[PDB]
Amino acid sequence: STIEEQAKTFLDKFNHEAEDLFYQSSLASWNYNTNITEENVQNMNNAGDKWSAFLKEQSTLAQMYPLQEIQNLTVKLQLQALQQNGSSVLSEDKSKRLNTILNTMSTIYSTGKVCNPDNPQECLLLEPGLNEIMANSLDYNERLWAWESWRSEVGKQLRPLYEEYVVLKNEMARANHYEDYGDYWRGDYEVNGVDGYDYSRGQLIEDVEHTFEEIKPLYEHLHAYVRAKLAYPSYISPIGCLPAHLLGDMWGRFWTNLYSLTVPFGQKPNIDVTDAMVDQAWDAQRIFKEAEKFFVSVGLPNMTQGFWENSMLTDPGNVQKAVCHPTAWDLGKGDFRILMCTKVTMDDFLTAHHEMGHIQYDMAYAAQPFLLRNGANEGFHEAVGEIMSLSAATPKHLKSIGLLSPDFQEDNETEINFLLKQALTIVGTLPFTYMLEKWRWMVFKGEIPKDQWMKKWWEMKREIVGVVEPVPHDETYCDPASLFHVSNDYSFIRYYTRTLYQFQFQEALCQAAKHEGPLHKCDISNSTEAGQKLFNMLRLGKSEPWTLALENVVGAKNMNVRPLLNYFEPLFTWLKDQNKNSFVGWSTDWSPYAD
Amino acid sequence: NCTFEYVSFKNLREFVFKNIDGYFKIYSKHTPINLVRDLPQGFSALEPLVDLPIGINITRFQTLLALHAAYYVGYLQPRTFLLKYNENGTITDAVDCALDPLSETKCTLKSFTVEKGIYQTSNFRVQPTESIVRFPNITNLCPFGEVFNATRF
Amino acid sequence: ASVYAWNRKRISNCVADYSVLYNSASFSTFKCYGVSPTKLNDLCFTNVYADSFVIRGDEVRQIAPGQTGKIADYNYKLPDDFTGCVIAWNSNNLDSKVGGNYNYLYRLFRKSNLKPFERDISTEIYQAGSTPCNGVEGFNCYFPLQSYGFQPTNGVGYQPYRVVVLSFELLHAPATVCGPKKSTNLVKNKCVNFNFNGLTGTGVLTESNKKFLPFQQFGRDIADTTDAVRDPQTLEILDITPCSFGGV
Ligand SMILES: *[C@@H]1O[C@H](CO)[C@@H](O[C@@H]2O[C@H](CO)[C@@H](O)[C@H](O)[C@H]2NC(C)=O)[C@H](O)[C@H]1NC(C)=O
Ligand SMILES: *[C@@H]1O[C@H](CO)[C@@H](O[C@@H]2O[C@H](CO)[C@@H](O)[C@H](O)[C@H]2NC(C)=O)[C@H](O)[C@H]1NC(C)=O
Ligand SMILES: *[C@@H]1O[C@H](CO)[C@@H](O)[C@H](O)[C@H]1NC(C)=O
Ligand SMILES: *[C@@H]1O[C@H](CO)[C@@H](O)[C@H](O)[C@H]1NC(C)=O
């Protein structure tokens, strides 16, 4: 009778159709990703077209339902998640222009190939060529050439395309009642209609900035220590910033490649149970079984057998080609699989445990309707996967299952090495994530003029990240678009948010598990209370605001890096002690190209 | 609606059908005969064949014939009978008490053969032909009519 | 069968052995309402209605007297005075497949609830609002049945579960479907409390000499007391002597 009841019935029918349609699309995608054939691409295209047409038709037929007269919170959330026209809010011409520009920039990024002047034929892509060149090879000249060529032959092409994509995104967000496309992406975290749990889009910016300011002393000390360790004293001033190419990657996102150049104690062996796993003859199935046993130990339910009979864990030979990217497939209608090319390594151990945490989260909110069968935001599922991998990475867990021999000792130097490596892996990209997200926000909102875009970037690179470009780049360069997310229209704040979520969740679990000792030694094994507390929010998924889940887990309704401070406090003290003679911070004026 | 299903002149086939307490019982007897007009004046027994827990309140019946004779139908009264079980329990003879006074004597003496003598069977009773109710006159009527026929109310 | 099209089988005129099924130990749910499973094994009924269908795991609890939900209201309803049983076993290897076992359908929309022992097959497009359906789905108009999604990967509450409801009828007609009436090996030349189809006598059983009729069951004396019994298991007559006793 009432419009709300009609909307509820329409959403129910949409879920009924979407179950089958998305299941067919997901099974076709799994077939393609386990066997790359032309027919697999054909059914992929067919399923994608069918799914997109169905979604657009349902969005059009649901947009006529007024959301202001609907008092049901879940129904309103489902309707607003279904009615989001997105880029279709513009005309067909503008929408197809935006799609073509996105495809072109993604193709340029993926096919970005640089050729050395010595041999024009000898060309290498960013991956695995340039990434290995500037991640493993320590030659300053080669890394500088790779970085400059990658940002030149790609940035110059992308800059007009990226500008047009930005303006199209801004105009569609304005047509979507958003001040800019940055606000459009911040709307994912937006919570409305819930007393004591509403979240605003600008609150995301405020929280990210506050957390970065809190991390600023720790990141300054880590940057000072890395600069003192850096390998390249001639090209790196002790007071000046760090070269972009000398950070293990083109964008300086991850400094773990500098770990060999920034190891606290090189004589201390790293914790790796790969050798024992080979001795114990562990394989992909054994690793998955041990991970399932660990998940059951914390209290989570036993995992399905259809997973084993359908999921691909090893390389399926060479007759058929399969995607080796770590993926947790929630195919819908109760179908949960994991696609991996799992080898006998500790890294694959942790990655498999991460994917299994993903699958546990996916099955937790499987009882939710189709619109609510997803994580709370872009950073919730990844947080669960990361905390599960970290719990699997603890020395206590490895010793308990026999992977780490009991005679192995844990000393302060080994703990410092582990903490510093975790820092370079996690907090190394946090300033980079913050600055790139702020640049994207200002670019979409339009504060940064075009003829100043790059001029702005390398400014905060020297200030926010303490990273200086080895050679100057003018506005023709589109170095931010040289990254995957900027050139593929992906929110980059998701990594910072998932880092904060995973730190908060890990601290809350350790408090619930009553861990004794350092936070980095906290293992949630044989802790049913921690597993139950995690399940209390895993089942919700996105059926409830993410602020409510965060409050239920850690007692705080908003972001904070206090768990990160607790985790890195021994490392923070060690870095502060080491940087007594090394200048802490960076110098923006100094640059490698200026003598 | 089906609630039950079952599958199993020179000759005379006799049958007795009765429904008691929801159980339908059939007692059959197939015999060789040499006659074409009326029932033989002899004796035979009827043994049960089928009982069915159906209880369908059956009140009417009709025979069924196939189109490419004669038959007889009686009725059953709630009578008292005496039966003579033989050495191995085959009903050799029976007597109906209500048939006639001699039969009543046989029933009350528990013997097919009655010794000469006088025997009491029952007690003749004359039932009331009707009922009569007698009361005194009803002359003493109350003044209901005066309220009914009240000129002034 | 589908839950909205649950198949009803009428069972009568046979011995019903619920002991094997109750002890088969291959079923997820076994809820006998108003009667113990072992007790109903030695119990008679006039009719047994077996309503067979397939539902999800979470819908299994909906099959009970006084229950609500889409399955309990639009697909099938159980009476509050339900004397039968509910049996349920997984059919994931049977009623699920990779790609989706879509043959089963469940009624999700109906103008009203269902009566007990009522099956709804109507496929009328349910009108949630005021827009006439006119036989097609549109705004405020959707199919009453949704296809079941059953795969070998589904969760416990989503796997295909085969459920049969055994409704026991004891109407005015005499009972037909009864239990095994568990027999016991008999003895002889011994003072034993014997029972033969309800005779429940007491004494000593001996080999007989008298011959019964094929339709006969037990004998009697002139004083109208049980003396001979034909064994129901094997057709032979046995004489009965009362238990030995006397004065002291
Ligand atoms: C048993 O009934 C039949 C029917 O008249 C008769 O059977 C005779 O006696 C026994 C069986 O009990 C057998 O020898 C034969 O079946 C019959 N006898 C002969 C000589 O053929 C008899 O009336 C009854 N039995 C007895 C002993 O009287
Ligand atoms: C009930 O079942 C038992 C077990 O088979 C039957 O006993 C056998 O019956 C067959 C034929 O009926 C005979 O050939 C065997 O000799 C019997 N066994 C023994 C040990 O004697 C029994 O007959 C069945 N009941 C009825 C009424 O047939
Ligand atoms: C049979 O008829 C009687 C009254 O004539 C009624 O009370 C009873 O319920 C009926 N039973 C059946 C099975 O028709
Ligand atoms: C008065 O009494 C007479 C007597 O027969 C009767 O017929 C008449 O109906 C009565 N009328 C009233 C109003 O009582």
Residue numbers in the entry:
A (entry chain E): 19 to 248, 251 to 615
B (entry chain D): 165 to 172, 186 to 245, 263 to 347
C (entry chain F): 348 to 595
What does the paper say about this structure?
We describe the development of a biologic that takes advantage of the proximity of the N-terminus of bound ACE2 to the three-fold symmetry axis of the spike protein to create an ultrapotent, trivalent ACE2 entry antagonist. Therefore, we sought trimeric scaffolds to fuse three ACE2 moieties and leverage the inherent symmetry of the spike trimer to maximize avidity. Thus, we determined a trimeric antagonist fused to the N-terminus of ACE2 would require a short peptide linker and would be less likely to form inter-spike interactions. The collagen VIII trimerization domain is significantly larger than the collagen XVIII domain (44.7 kDa and 19.3 kDa, respectively), but more importantly, previous studies reported that collagen VIII melts at ~45 °C66, whereas the collagen XVIII domain melts at ~85 °C (vide infra). Given these observations, the smaller, more thermally stable collagen XVIII trimerization domain was advanced to develop the trimeric antagonist.
Next, variable lengths of glycine-serine peptide linkers (0, 1, 3, 5, 18 amino acids) were tested to bridge the trimerization domain and ACE2 domains. To simplify the nomenclature, we refer to these constructs as TXA, where ‘T’ indicates the collagen XVIII trimerization domain, ‘X’ refers to the number of residues in the linker, and ‘A’ refers to ACE2. Analysis of the other complexes, both with longer (5 and 18 amino acids) and shorter (“zero” amino acids) linker lengths, was conducted to better understand the role of the linker with respect to the symmetry of the trimeric antagonist. Notably, we did not observe discernible density for the collagen XVIII trimerization domains of the longer linker length constructs (T5A or T18A), whereas we did observe clear density connecting the trimerization domain and ACE2 in the zero-linker length, T0A. We then attempted to evaluate the ‘symmetry of interaction’ between our ACE2 constructs with spike protein (T0A-S, T3A-S, T5A-S, and T18A-S; where S is the SARS-CoV-2 spike HexaPro protein) by likening the C3 symmetry to an equilateral triangle with all sides being equal length and a corresponding standard deviation between these lengths of zero (s.d. = 0). Thus, we calculated lengths (distances) and corresponding standard deviations between the Cα atoms of equivalent residues in the RBDs of the spike protein (residue D428; as determined by Fan et al.) and in each of the ACE2 domains (residue N137; arbitrarily determined residue on ACE2) (red and black dashed lines, respectively). The calculated mean distances and s.d. between spike RBD were: 41 ± 3.6 Å for T0A-S; 40 ± 1.0 Å for T3A-S; 40 ± 1.0 Å for T5A-S; and 42 ± 3.2 Å for T18A-S. Equating lower s.d. values to symmetry, we determine T3A and T5A to have higher symmetry than T0A or T18A.
